[PDB]
CSV table of C-alpha atoms and ligand atoms in Angstrom, one decimal:
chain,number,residue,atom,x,y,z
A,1,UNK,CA,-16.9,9.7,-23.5
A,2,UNK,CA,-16.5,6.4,-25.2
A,3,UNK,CA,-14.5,3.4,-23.7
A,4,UNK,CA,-13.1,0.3,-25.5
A,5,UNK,CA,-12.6,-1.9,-22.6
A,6,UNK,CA,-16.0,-1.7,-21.7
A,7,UNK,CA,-16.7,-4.1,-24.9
A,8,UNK,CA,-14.2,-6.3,-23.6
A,9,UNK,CA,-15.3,-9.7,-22.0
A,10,UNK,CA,-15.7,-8.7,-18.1
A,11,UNK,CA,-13.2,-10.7,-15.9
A,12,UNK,CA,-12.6,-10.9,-12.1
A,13,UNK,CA,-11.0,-13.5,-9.8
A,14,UNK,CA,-9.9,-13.2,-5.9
A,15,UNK,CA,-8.7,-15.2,-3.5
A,16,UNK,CA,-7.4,-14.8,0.3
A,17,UNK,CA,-3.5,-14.6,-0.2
A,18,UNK,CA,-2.4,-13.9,3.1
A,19,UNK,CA,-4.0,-16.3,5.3
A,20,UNK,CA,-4.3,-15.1,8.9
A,21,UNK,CA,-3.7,-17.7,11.7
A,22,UNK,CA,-7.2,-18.9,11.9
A,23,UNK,CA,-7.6,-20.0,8.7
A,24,UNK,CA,-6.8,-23.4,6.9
A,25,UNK,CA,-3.3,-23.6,5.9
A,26,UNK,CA,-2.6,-20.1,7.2
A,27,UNK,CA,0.7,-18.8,6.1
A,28,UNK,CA,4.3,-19.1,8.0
A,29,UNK,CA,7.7,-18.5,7.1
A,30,UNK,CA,10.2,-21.6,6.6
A,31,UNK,CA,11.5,-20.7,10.1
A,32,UNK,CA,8.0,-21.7,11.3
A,33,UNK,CA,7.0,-18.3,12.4
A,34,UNK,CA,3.4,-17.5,12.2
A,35,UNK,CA,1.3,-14.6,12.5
A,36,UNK,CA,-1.6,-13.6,13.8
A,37,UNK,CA,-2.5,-11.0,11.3
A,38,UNK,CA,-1.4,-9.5,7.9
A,39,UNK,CA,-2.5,-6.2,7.2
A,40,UNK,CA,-0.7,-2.8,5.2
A,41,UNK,CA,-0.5,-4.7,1.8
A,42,UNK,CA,1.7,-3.5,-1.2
A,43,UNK,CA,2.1,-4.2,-4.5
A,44,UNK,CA,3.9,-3.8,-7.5
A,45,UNK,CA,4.6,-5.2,-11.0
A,46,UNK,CA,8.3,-5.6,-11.7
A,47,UNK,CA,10.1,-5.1,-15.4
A,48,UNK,CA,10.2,-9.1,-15.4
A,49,UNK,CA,6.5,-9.0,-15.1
A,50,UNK,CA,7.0,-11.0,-12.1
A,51,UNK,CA,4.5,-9.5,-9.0
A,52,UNK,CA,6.0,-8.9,-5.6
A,53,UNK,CA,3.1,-8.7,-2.8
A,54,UNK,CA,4.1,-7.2,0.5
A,55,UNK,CA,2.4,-7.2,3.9
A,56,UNK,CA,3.0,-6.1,7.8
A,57,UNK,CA,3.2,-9.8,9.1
A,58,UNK,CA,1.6,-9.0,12.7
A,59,UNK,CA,2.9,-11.7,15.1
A,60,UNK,CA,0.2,-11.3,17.8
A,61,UNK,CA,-2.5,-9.5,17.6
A,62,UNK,CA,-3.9,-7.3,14.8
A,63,UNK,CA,-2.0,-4.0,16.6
A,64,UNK,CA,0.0,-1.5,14.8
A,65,UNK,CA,2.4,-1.7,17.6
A,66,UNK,CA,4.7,-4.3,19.3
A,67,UNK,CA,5.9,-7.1,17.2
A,68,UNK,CA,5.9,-6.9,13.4
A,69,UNK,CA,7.8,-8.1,10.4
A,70,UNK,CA,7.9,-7.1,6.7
A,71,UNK,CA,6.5,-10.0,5.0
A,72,UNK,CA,6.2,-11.0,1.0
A,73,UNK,CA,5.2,-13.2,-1.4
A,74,UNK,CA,6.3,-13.7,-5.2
A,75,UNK,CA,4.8,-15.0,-8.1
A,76,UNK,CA,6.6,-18.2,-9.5
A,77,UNK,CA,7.0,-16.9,-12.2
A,78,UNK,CA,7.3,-13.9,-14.2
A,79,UNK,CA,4.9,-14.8,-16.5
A,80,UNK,CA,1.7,-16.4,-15.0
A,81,UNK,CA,0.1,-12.7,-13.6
A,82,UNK,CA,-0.5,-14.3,-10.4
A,83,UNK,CA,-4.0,-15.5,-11.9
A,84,UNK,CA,-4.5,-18.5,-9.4
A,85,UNK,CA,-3.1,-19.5,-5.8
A,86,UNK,CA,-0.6,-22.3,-6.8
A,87,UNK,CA,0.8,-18.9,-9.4
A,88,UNK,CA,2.2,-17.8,-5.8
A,89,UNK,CA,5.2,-18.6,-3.7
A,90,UNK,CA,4.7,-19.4,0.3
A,91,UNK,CA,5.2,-16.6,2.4
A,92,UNK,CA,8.4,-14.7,2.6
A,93,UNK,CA,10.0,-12.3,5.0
A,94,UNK,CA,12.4,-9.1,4.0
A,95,UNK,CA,12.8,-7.9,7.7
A,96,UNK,CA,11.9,-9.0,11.1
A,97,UNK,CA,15.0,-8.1,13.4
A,98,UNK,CA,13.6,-7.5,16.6
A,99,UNK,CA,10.8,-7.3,18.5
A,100,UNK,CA,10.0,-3.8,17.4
A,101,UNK,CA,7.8,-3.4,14.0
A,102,UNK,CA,8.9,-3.1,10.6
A,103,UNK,CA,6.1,-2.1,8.3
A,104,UNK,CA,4.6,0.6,6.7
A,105,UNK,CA,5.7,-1.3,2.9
A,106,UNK,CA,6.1,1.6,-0.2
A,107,UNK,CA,7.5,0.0,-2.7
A,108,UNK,CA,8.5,1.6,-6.1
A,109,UNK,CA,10.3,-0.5,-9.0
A,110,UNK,CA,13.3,1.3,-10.8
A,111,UNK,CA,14.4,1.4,-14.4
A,112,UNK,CA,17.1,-1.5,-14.0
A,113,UNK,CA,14.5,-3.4,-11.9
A,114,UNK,CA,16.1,-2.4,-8.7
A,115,UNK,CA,13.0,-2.7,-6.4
A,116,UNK,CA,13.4,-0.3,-3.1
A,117,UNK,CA,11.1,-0.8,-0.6
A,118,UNK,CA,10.3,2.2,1.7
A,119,UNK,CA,10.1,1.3,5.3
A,120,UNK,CA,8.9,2.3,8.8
A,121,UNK,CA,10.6,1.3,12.2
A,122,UNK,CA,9.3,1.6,15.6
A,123,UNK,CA,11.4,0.0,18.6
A,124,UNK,CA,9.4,-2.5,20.5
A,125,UNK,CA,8.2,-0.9,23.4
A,126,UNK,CA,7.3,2.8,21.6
A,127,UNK,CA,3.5,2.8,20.4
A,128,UNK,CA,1.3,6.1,18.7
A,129,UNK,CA,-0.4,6.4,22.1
A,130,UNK,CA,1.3,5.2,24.6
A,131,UNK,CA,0.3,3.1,27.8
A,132,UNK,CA,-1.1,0.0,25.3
A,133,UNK,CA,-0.9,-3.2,26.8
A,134,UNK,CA,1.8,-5.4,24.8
A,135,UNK,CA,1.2,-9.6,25.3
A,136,UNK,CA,3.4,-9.7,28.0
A,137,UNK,CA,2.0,-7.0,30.4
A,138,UNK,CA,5.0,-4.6,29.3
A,139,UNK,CA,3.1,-1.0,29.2
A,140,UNK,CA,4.4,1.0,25.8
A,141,UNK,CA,5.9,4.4,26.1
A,142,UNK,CA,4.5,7.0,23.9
A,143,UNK,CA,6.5,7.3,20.3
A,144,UNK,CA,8.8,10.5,20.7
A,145,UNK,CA,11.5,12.7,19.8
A,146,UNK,CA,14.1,11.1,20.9
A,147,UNK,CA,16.4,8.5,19.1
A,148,UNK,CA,15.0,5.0,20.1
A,149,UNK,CA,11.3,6.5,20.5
A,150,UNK,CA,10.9,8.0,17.0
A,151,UNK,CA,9.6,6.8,13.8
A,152,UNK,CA,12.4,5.6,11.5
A,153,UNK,CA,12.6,5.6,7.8
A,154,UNK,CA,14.4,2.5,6.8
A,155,UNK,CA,15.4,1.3,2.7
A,156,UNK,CA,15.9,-2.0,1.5
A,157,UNK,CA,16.5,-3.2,-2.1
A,158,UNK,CA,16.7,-6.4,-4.3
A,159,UNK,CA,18.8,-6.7,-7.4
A,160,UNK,CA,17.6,-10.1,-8.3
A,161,UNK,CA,13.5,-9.0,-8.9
A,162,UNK,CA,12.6,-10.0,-5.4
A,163,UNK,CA,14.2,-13.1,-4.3
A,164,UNK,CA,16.7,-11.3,-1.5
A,165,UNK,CA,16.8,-8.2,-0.1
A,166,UNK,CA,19.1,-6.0,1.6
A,167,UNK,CA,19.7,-5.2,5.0
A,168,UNK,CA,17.5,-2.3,5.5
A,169,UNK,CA,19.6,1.1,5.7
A,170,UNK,CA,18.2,3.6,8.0
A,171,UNK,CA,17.6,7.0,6.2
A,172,UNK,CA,15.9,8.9,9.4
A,173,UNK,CA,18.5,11.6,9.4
A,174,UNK,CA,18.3,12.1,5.9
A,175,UNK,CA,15.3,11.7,4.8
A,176,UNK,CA,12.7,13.0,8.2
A,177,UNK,CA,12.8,16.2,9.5
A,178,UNK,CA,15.1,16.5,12.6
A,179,UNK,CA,12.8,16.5,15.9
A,180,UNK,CA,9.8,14.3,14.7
A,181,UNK,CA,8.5,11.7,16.4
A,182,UNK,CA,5.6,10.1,14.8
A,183,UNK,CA,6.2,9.2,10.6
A,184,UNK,CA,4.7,6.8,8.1
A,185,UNK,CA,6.0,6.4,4.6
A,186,UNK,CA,3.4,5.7,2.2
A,187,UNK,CA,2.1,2.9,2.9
A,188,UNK,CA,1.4,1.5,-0.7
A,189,UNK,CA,3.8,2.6,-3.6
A,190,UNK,CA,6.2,5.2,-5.0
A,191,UNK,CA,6.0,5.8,-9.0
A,192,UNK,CA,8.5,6.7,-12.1
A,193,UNK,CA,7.8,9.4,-13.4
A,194,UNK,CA,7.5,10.2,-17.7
A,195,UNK,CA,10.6,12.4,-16.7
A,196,UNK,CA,12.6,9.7,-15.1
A,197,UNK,CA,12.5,10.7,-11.5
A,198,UNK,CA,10.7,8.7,-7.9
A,199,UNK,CA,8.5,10.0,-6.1
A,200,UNK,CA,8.2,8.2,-2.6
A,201,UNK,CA,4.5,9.5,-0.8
A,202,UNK,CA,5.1,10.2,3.0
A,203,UNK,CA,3.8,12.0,6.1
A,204,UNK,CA,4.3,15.8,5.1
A,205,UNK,CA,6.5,15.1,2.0
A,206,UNK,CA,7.6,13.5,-0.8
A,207,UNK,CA,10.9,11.5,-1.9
A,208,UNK,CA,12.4,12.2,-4.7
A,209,UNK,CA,14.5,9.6,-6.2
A,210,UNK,CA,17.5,11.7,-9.1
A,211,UNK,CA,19.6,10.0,-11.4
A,212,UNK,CA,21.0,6.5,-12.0
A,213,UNK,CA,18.2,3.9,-11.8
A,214,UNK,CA,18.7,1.8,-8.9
A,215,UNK,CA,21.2,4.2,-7.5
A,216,UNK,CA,19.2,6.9,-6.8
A,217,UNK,CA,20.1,10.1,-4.8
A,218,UNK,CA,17.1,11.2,-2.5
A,219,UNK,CA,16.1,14.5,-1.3
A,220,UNK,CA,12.7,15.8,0.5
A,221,UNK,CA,10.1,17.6,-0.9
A,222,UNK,CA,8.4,19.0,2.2
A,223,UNK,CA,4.5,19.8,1.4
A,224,UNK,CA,2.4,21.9,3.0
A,225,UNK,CA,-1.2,20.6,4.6
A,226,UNK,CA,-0.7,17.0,3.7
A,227,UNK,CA,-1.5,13.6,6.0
A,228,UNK,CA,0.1,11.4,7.5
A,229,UNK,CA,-1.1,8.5,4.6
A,230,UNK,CA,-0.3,9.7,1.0
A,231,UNK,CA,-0.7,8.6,-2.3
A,232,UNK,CA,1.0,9.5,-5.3
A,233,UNK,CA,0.4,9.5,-9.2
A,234,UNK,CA,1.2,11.2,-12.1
A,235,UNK,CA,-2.0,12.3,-14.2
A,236,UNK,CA,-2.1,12.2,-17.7
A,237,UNK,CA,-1.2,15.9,-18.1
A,238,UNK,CA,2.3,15.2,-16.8
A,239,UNK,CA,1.7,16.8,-13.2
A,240,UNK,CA,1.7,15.0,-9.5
A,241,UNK,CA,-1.2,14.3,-7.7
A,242,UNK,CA,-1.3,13.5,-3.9
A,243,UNK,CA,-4.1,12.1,-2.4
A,244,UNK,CA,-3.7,11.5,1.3
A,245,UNK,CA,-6.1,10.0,4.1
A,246,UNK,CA,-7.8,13.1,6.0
A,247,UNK,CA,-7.5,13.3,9.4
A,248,UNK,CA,-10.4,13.2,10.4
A,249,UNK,CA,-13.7,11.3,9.0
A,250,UNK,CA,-14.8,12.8,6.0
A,251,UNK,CA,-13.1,12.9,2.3
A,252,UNK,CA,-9.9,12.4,0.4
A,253,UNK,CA,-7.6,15.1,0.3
A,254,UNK,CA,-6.0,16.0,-2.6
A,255,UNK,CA,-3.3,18.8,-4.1
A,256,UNK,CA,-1.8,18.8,-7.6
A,257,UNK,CA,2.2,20.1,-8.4
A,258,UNK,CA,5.0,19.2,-10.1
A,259,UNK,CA,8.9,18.3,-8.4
A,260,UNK,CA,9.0,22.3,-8.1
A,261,UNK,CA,6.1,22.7,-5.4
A,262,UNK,CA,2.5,22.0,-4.7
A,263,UNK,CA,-0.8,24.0,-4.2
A,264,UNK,CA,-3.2,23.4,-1.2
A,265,UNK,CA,-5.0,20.6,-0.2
A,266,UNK,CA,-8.6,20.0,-0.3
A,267,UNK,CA,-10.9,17.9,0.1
A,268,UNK,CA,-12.6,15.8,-3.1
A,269,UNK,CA,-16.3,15.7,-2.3
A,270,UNK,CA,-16.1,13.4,-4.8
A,271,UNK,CA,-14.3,10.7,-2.8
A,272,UNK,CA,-15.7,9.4,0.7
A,273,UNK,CA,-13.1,8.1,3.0
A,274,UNK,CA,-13.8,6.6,6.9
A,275,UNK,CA,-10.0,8.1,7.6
A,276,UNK,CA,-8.7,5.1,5.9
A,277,UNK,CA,-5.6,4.6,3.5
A,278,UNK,CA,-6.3,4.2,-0.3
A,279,UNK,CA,-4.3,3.7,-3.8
A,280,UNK,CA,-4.1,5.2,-6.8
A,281,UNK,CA,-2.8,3.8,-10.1
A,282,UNK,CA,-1.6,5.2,-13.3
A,283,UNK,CA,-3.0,3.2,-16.0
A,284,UNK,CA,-2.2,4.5,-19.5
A,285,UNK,CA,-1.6,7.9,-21.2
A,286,UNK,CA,-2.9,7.2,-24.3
A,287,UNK,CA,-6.8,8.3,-25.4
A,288,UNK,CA,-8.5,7.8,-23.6
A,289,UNK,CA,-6.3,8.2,-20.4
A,290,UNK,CA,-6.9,6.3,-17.3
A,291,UNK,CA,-6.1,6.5,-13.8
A,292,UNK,CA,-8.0,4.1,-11.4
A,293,UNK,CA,-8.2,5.2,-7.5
A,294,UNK,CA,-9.6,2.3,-4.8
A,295,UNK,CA,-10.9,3.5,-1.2
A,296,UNK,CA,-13.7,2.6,1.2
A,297,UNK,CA,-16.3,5.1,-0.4
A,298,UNK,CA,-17.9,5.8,3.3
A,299,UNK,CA,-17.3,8.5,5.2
A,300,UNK,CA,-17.6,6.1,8.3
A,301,UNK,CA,-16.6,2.2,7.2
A,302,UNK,CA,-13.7,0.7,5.8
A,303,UNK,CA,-16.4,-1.9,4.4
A,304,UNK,CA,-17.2,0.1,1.3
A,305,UNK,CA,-14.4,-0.8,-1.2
A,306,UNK,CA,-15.2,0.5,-4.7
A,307,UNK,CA,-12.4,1.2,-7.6
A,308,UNK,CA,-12.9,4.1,-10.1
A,309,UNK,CA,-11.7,5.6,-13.0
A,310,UNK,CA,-11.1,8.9,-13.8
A,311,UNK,CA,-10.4,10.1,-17.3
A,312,UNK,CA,-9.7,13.5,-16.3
A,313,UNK,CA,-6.3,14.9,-17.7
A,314,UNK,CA,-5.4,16.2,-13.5
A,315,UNK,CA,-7.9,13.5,-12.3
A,316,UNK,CA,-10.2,15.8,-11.0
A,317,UNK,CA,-13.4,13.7,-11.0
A,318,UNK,CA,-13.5,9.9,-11.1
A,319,UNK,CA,-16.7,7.7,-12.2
A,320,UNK,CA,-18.8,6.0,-9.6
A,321,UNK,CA,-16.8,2.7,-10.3
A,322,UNK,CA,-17.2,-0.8,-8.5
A,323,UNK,CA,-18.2,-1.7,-5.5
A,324,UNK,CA,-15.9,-4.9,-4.5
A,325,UNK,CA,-18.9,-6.4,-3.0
A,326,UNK,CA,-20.1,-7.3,-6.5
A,327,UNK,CA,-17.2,-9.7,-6.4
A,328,UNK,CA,-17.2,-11.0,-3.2
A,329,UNK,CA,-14.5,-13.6,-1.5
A,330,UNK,CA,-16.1,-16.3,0.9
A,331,UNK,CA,-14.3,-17.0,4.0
A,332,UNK,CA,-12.0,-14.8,4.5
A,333,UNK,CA,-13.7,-12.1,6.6
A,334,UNK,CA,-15.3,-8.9,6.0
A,335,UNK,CA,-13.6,-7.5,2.9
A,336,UNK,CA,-12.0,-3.6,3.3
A,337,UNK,CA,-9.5,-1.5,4.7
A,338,UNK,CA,-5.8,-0.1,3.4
A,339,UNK,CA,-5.5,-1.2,-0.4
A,340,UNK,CA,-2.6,-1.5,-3.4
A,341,UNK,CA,-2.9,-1.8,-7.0
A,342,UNK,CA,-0.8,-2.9,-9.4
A,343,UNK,CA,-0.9,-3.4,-13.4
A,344,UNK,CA,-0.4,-6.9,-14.6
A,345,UNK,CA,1.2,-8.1,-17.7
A,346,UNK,CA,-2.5,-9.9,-19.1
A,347,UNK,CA,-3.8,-5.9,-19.0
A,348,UNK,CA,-6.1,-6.8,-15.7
A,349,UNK,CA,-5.4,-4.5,-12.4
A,350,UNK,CA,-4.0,-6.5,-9.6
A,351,UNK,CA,-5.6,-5.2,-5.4
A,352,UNK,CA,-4.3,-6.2,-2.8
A,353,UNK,CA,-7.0,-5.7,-0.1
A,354,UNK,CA,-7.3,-6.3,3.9
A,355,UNK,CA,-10.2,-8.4,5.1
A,356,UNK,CA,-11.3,-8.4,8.8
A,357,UNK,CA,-12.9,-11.4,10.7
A,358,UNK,CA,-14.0,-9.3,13.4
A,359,UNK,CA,-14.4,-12.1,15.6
A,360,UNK,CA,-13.2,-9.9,18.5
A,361,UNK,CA,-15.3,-6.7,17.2
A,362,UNK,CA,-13.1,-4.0,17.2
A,363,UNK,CA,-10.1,-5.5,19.4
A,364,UNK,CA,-6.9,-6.9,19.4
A,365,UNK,CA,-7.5,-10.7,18.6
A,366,UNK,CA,-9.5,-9.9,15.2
A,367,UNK,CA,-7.9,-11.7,12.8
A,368,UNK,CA,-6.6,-10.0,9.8
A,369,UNK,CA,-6.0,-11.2,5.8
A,370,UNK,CA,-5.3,-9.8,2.9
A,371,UNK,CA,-7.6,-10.1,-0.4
A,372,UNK,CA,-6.3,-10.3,-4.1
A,373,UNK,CA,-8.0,-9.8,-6.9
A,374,UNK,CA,-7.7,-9.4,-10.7
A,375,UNK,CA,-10.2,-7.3,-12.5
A,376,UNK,CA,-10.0,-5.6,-15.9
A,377,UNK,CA,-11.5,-2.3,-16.6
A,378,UNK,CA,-14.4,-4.1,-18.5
A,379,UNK,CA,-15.4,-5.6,-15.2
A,380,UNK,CA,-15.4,-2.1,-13.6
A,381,UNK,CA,-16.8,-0.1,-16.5
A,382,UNK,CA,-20.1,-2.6,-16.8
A,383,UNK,CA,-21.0,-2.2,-12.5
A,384,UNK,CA,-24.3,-1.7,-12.1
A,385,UNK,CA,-24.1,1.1,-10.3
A,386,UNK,CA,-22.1,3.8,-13.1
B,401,KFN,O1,-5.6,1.1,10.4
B,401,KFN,C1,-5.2,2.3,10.7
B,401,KFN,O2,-6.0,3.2,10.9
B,401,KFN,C2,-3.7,2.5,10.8
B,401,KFN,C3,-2.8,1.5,10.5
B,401,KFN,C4,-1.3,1.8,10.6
B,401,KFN,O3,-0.6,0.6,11.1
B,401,KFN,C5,-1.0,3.1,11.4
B,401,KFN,O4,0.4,3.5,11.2
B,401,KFN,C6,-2.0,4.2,10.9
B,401,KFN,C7,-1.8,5.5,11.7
B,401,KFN,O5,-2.3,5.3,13.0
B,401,KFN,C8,-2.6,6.7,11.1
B,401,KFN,O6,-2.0,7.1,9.9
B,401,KFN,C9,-2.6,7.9,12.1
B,401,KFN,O7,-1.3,8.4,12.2
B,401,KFN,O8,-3.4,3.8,11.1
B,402,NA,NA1,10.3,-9.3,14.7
């Protein structure tokens, strides 16, 4: 029942760190390319400590089609925990061939400090729908079945703790079932597991990641009633845990397994979700366990962000938590949307977190940034609303 860290001194601190193209010094690549949005953020803690952020770097509008590169930023160091805006290097990209988009950022960080980062591919005149509208009156063709309609599942790597990457490999006929059209990986992060092996979330599966760290073979672990969205975590009693956007309004939905097989999904009354991504992190294993889970806690807006803890050996039931809101940023939009967590090396959690200025209501030319934010588990624990 008890909790140390809620005797802890409470600490927060957030700050827009990618900075849309209306803002004040919004942020460009060295190339000079800007972007009119950032949205799909990832993060993860590498074995350096260093922090890699990544972000869909959306070149004209804030659209999920046409085109989009795979955008980063580091920490300068691998020490500093990314506690303050000059802690973070300007804008980077790790793909942005085309004029197709490159997004849908999972990262995971192996043993040897390879980081692989997940990818999705769309060509540049493929959307979801179909028939949208792209900035230069081209009409898309609906995302298909077919070779250069489908979703691709692309993997890049760095050896050198972020600073370059790979060319991105294309893993499609590997790693997607053969005659799919529409996929996402993740988007967020893939995990290490206590037993050594990665598991990647995706639409309808898992990754798993065997052997040699940072030279991993990969296989599919096809799943049964899962989104398109997932999240992945190992709880404390050694078991996986997805817990995927719905598909329709409503709740979280979540299964439990191991690298053998899952049980059913279902949804966690527990957990509100507007049919919105989430994250989930794996904090610590030792008493008193702790695995923290962020989403818009609505069942119909993105604008309810509120992190949670649950102490529940197969997380069944997480506390009430923290509503964001409590720690709001100033002009950077309207705070919520897709998330990512990370752990940092000064024991805070690091979120990444989109913001909307929703200057165009719901259309294309609302600008998009992305929030982060350092808060320890004191600062959630002592909410006013657990
Ligand atoms: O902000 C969203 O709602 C969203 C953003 C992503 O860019 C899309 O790939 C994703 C996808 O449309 C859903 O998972 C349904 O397949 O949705
Ligand atoms: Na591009």
């Amino acid at each position: 029942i008890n909790d140390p860290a809620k005797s802890a001194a409470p600490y927060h601190d957030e700050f827009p760190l990618f900075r849309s193209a209306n803002m004040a010094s919004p942020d460009k690549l060295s190339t000079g390319i800007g972007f009119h949005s950032f949205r799909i953020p990832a993060v993860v803690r590498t074995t350096t400590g260093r922090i890699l952020a990544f972000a869909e770097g959306r070149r004209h509008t804030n659209q999920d089609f046409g085109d989009i590169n795979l955008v980063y930023k580091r920490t300068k160091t691998t020490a500093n925990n990314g506690a303050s805006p000059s802690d973070w290097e300007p804008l980077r990209e790790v793909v942005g061939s085309g004029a197709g988009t490159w997004g849908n950022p999972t990262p995971v960080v192996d043993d040897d400090n390879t980081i692989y980062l997940f990818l999705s591919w769309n060509g540049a005149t493929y959307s979801q729908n179909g028939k949208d509208v792209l900035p230069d009156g081209t009409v898309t063709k609906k995302i298909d079945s077919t070779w250069e309609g489908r979703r691709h599942l692309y993997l890049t790597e760095s050896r050198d703790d972020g600073n370059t990457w790979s060319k991105p490999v294309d893993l499609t006929k590997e790693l997607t079932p053969d005659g799919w059209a529409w996929d996402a990986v993740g988007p967020g992060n893939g995990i290490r597991l206590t037993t050594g092996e990665l598991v990647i979330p995706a639409m309808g599966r898992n990754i798993i990641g065997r052997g040699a760290p940072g030279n991993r073979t990969w296989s599919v672990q096809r799943l049964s009633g899962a989104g398109a969205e997932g999240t992945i975590v190992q709880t404390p009693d050694g078991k996986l845990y997805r817990n995927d956007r719905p598909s329709q309004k409503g709740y979280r939905m979540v299964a439990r397994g191991t690298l053998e097989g899952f049980g059913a999904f279902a949804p966690d009354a527990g957990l509100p979700d507007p049919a919105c991504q989430g994250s989930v992190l794996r904090y610590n294993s030792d008493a008193p366990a702790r695995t923290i889970f962020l989403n818009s806690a609505s069942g119909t807006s993105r604008r309810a962000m509120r992190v949670r803890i649950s102490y529940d050996a197969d997380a069944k039931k997480f506390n009430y938590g923290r509503k964001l809101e409590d720690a709001k940023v100033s002009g950077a939009g309207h705070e919520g949307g897709y998330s990512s967590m990370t752990k940092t090396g000064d024991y805070k959690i690091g979120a990444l977190v989109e913001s909307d200025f929703f200057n165009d209501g719901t259309g294309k030319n609302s600008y998009r940034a992305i929030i982060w934010r350092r808060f320890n588990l004191s600062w959630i624990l002592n909410g006013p609303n657990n």
